[PDB]
Write a protein that binds this ligand. Structure first.
Ligand SMILES: CN(c1ncnc2[nH]c3cc(F)ccc3c12)[C@@H]1CCCS(=O)(=O)C1
Length: 167
């Protein structure tokens, strides 16, 4: 039993809710919140900008030190950093950004990072400003992640479309 509330069950291990991931993280304080990161961990907009704003920019300060030490992530890769006031840990995962021309096949590799964590609160990778089809992202999530994932979808209209079209 866990504290996630109001989710619709899609499969054995994948759950979905119309919610603001920032507000959901603040309430649940999950072990892991996933960020929709880029390779530079520049948290300017989308989910990343919202999560970073909620940490009063502490996420960005920590991220800049990480990049100065380690260099950029790979598209499809991830790193574990602090969850600050939102979660124990933040798993920063880089899905391909279609608006930069990155290979959508890398979306499966991105979701594989979730399997290193037993339970996660997450957005749909490569959705939103990353330019992928969120219905495709949900399909890859369900077909790739084997651990327990609680997906937060900000847009109510999109949430309803994702549920109604789910096979
Ligand atoms: C981006 N995205 C999110 N997913 C969950 N939580 C969020 N919080 C946010 C705060 C922002 F400022 C921007 C965005 C999000 C967000 C999802 C991708 C398609 C649109 S969506 O919004 O339907 C779901």
């Amino acid at each position: 039993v866990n504290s996630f509330s109001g989710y619709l069950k899609l499969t054995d291990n994948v759950y979905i809710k119309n919610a603001d991931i920032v507000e959901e993280a603040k309430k649940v304080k999950p072990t892991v919140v996933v960020n929709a990161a880029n390779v530079y961990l520049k948290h300017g907009g989308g989910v990343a900008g919202a999560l970073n704003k909620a940490t009063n920019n502490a996420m960005q300060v920590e991220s800049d030190d990480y990049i100065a030490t380690n260099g950029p992530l790979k598209v499809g890769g991830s790193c574990v950093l602090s969850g600050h006031n939102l979660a124990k840990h933040c798993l920063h995962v880089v899905g391909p950004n279609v608006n930069k021309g990155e290979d959508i096949q890398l979306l499966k590799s991105a979701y594989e990072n979730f399997n290193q964590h037993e339970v996660l609160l997450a957005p749909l990778l490569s959705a939103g400003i990353f330019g992928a089809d969120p219905i495709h992202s949900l399909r890859v999530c369900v077909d790739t992640v084997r651990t327990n994932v609680y997906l937060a979808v900000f847009d109510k209209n999109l949430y309803d479309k994702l549920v109604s079209s789910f096979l």
